[PDB]
Amino acid sequence: PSPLMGGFGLKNPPPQILIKNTPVPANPPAEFSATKFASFITQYSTGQVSVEIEWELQKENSKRWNPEVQYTSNYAKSANVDFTVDNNGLYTEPRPIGTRYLTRPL
Amino acid sequence: DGVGNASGNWHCDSTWLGDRVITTSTRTWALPTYNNHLYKQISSASTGASNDNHYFGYSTPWGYFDFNRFHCHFSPRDWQRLINNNWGFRPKRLNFKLFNIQVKEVTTNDGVTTIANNLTSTVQVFSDSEYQLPYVLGSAHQGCLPPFPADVFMIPQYGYLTLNNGSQAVGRSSFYCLEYFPSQMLRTGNNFTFSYTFEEVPFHSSYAHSQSLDRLMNPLIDQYLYYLNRTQNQSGSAQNKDLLFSRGSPAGMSVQPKNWLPGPCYRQQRVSKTKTDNNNSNFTWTGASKYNLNGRESIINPGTAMASHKDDEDKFFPMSGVMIFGKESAGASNTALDNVMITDEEEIKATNPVATERFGTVAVNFQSSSTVPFKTDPATGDVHAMGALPGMVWQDRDVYLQGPIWAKIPHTDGHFHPSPLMGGFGLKNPPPQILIKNTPVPANPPAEFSATKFASFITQYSTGQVSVEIEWELQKENSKRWNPEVQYTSNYAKSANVDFTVDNNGLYTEPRPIGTRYLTRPL
Amino acid sequence: AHSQSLDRLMNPLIDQYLYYLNRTQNQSGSAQNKDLLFSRGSPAGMSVQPKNWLPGPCYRQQRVSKTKTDNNNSNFTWTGASKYNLNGRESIINPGTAMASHKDDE
């Protein structure tokens, strides 16, 4: 049961955190009406969210002699730096980065 | 506890223990200002009603909290879980909480409306724990917590009726100022709590009977009791009288001596759900069972707990003997049979008379032979209203997910079997009324003093959250029945919508009324 | 005494959620066709609202006027009276069930 998109398949994954604004009704009528409220005060909310994950690592223990393939930035004069913002303030990721760079015997 | 600190959380849940179920419901309410903070005297004098519809009473500026329907507490799934598995149930205790109060000021200028927060305004809340006020709960009124937890509801206005002589009052007509009570004043950081314990009420019966009352005998063994079978000769060649006695046998079960009687009856008029078979007249008032009280008539509606119809007669219902719930998109007046849901009391045919038929026949004369050469044939008459006789047994009306839970038993000298006729639990001390109103905030007073009472107020309403938690005691089935029971089930079929859900417009609907009597037990 | 009547125990401002059969004929009146029209329990018609309780038991008595001219010209204190049969001999109820002596203005 490993997900086909990649990642960790969990029987009990991190649960969903669900959030909503509590409805605030607008001015009710002077006389009672059993029809459910449809007029609400229009509002939104803003805030800060923090997520902290501890990850366990499994270190390489290789006896390989020659140097390994590593993920590296390209050294060259470029109009922009990779994984940065442009002059308009837009953060971009130039390429997808995988994980499989170190090697081990089969 | 402050402006920026919430005074409560959303508690909407249902916990099933072994013999208890605890249902919690939170809803969002809006309370307006009623009557411009005035107490008003209301009557029928301007209405010009009939003598039967005359009334006198008072309208208060207060609203009240109502959670006297079963769907305020049970989801349809929880109701199905209860009724498919329990032989009975009753309420044990409740907690009421009022929290997250927000008072809003409203100003309309040039047609545009501004709403602001009024951080220093209060709502007055009190519980009428000593039952010193007229109890208007238990009359099946609108304004309860909505069945769907996402719905926001308006709080209904409080008003009562007092003794009236037509549209006029009498000396013993009472007036109640609700400001003459101790109230808790709540600003936006305050909350209100209240606990209540139910009295020991009998379990409501979530079962039908597997036996009928006239079928309680062994069908294989005869009786040792005899009955008069013939008063004429059986041969028939002559037509002579006789006194022939037979033994109670399984061949004739209708004539066997028995130990008990069916419950009391008060006959209703029979109306067909197919309109072509009904008489071409109105007769909803002229042909209806009604009672006389102080000179004005009142429809029984629904009165004695009786079977709606016989076997193979589902097309008929008593004219005012059934609880009728309206579907959404049902008008207030003269709506259609398609827009209403008529309940059925088919499960209590085992012990209760059918609502549209007589209790039975009774002898009305003395039979005699010619001599006094005036022979008197025996004569019977139909018994249409039968009061309680010793040996009578009956079942009460069923409760429904959309129906009332309890009713206050009137404080009278006598009452017979004080179970409410709409169904539910009759309580001498029911859950008290929680009454709430916005404290009036006067507008700008004049520079010079005036003793005339204030009439200019700052227009405002309030909103908040209300939580009700009820613990219910369950009475589990202990059946030894072999074959499977009848259960309430969802229909498995491709349908445009799912039952007891919202539609594409967001409107929660309940397709049908659900009773309780699905499991069975022997009579 | 009671400050409320048994048929007047409702809130006079709020409607009911219970319906009753109001008409079995068409309301328009241009035709005289049958129908099944249901109305909601409302403060306008309080006599037809579903209710929870019933008035006490009754055993009707004969009505005598304190003004003797309005009474029938006969004795009828024994022939027209509510009485019960016990072992073949009749006994006047007197006073029997606890009921109101008269109506309003009577």
Say which of A22, A24, A28 has its CB closest to residue B154.
Answer: A28
CA–CA gap between residue B220 and residue B384 (Å, rounded): 34
**Binary contact (B159, C12; C-beta < 8 A):** yes
Q: What is the resolution of this structure in A?
A: 2.3
CA distances from A97 to A70, A72, A83, A101, B281 (A): 11, 10, 11, 10, 84
**Binary contact (A30, B32; C-beta < 8 A):** yes
CA–CA gap between residue B495 and residue B509 (Å, rounded): 15
B417 marked ligand binding residue: yes
**Binary contact (A22, B100; C-beta < 8 A):** yes
CA–CA gap between residue A98 and residue A84 (Å, rounded): 19
Strands (E) located in B248-403: 261-262, 265-266, 270-272, 290-293, 296-299, 316-318, 324-326, 335-336, 340-342, 360-363, 380-383, 385-386, 392-393
What is the maximum span of chain C, computed from C-alpha positions, in angstroms? 62
Residue B80: phi and psi, rounded to 5, are -65, -40
**Binary contact (A23, B152; C-beta < 8 A):** yes
CA–CA gap between residue B435 and residue B123 (Å, rounded): 10
Determine the distance in angstroms separating the CA of A21 from the nearest CA of chain B, rounded to an integer: 12
Q: What's at B262, amino acid-wise? A: P
Q: First CA to last CA across chain B, in angstroms?
A: 57
Q: Residue B129's closest CA among B191, B182, B90?
A: B182
CB B229 within 8 A of CB B244: yes
Handedness of CA C2, C3, C8, C13 (dihedral sign): negative
B287 marked ligand binding residue: no
Handedness of CA B349, B351, B356, B359 (dihedral sign): positive
Residues whose CB falls within 8 Å of the CB of residue B398, separated by 6 or more in sequence, listed in order? B343, B345, B347, B348, B423, B515, B516, B517
Say which of C5, C15, C24 has its CB closest to residue B278.
Answer: C24
Chain C interface, best mutation among A32, A33, A35, by max C CB count within 10 A: A32
CA–CA gap between residue B477 and residue B487 (Å, rounded): 13
CA–CA gap between residue B519 and residue B479 (Å, rounded): 9
Question: What residues of A are designated binding site?
Answer: 7, 9
Determine the distance in angstroms separating the CA of C6 from the nearest CA of chain B, rounded to an integer: 8
Strands (E) located in B85-148: 86-109, 112-117, 123-127
**Binary contact (B402, C50; C-beta < 8 A):** no
Strands B406-408 and B425-427: parallel
B55 vs C contacts (CB less than 8 Å): 8, 12, 43, 46
CA–CA gap between residue B443 and residue B455 (Å, rounded): 9
| Dihedral class, residue B303 (left if φ above 0, else alpha if ψ from -120 to 50, else beta) | left
Q: What's at B224, amino acid-wise? A: Y
Handedness of CA C25, C30, C32, C33 (dihedral sign): negative
Chain B to chain C Cβ contacts (< 8 Å): 223
**Binary contact (B28, A26; C-beta < 8 A):** no
Strands B184-186 and C18-25: unpaired
CB B248 within 8 A of CB B222: yes
CA–CA gap between residue C106 and residue B501 (Å, rounded): 57
What is the maximum span of chain B, computed from C-alpha positions, in angstroms? 113
Q: Residue B386's closest CA among B357, B415, B348, B420?
A: B357
Q: First CA to last CA across chain A, in angstroms?
A: 22
Element holding C89 (H helix, E strand):
strand C89-92
C15 vs A contacts (CB less than 8 Å): 34
Give the residue carrying structure tokens 């606990």: B195
**Closest-CA residue in chain C for A33?**
C14
**Closest-CA residue in chain A for B147?**
A36
Experimental method: cryo-EM
The strand pairing partners of B152, in sequence order, are B28
CA–CA gap between residue C70 and residue B336 (Å, rounded): 50
CA–CA gap between residue B447 and residue B439 (Å, rounded): 23
Determine the distance in angstroms separating the CA of A11 from the nearest CA of chain B, rounded to an integer: 25
**Binary contact (C10, B141; C-beta < 8 A):** yes
B426 marked ligand binding residue: yes
Residues whose CB falls within 8 Å of the CB of residue B387, separated by 6 or more in sequence, listed in order? B264, C57
Q: Which residues of C touch A (CB under 8 A)?
A: 13-15, 17
CA–CA gap between residue B31 and residue B462 (Å, rounded): 5
**Binary contact (C52, B421; C-beta < 8 A):** yes
Element holding B152 (H helix, E strand):
strand B152-154
C14 vs A contacts (CB less than 8 Å): 32
CB B79 within 8 A of CB B70: yes
- Torsion angle defined by CA atoms of residues B183, B186, B191 and B195, in that order, rounded to the nearest 10 degrees: 10
CA–CA gap between residue B203 and residue B515 (Å, rounded): 15
Chain B interface, best mutation among A20, A21, A32, by max B CB count within 10 A: A32
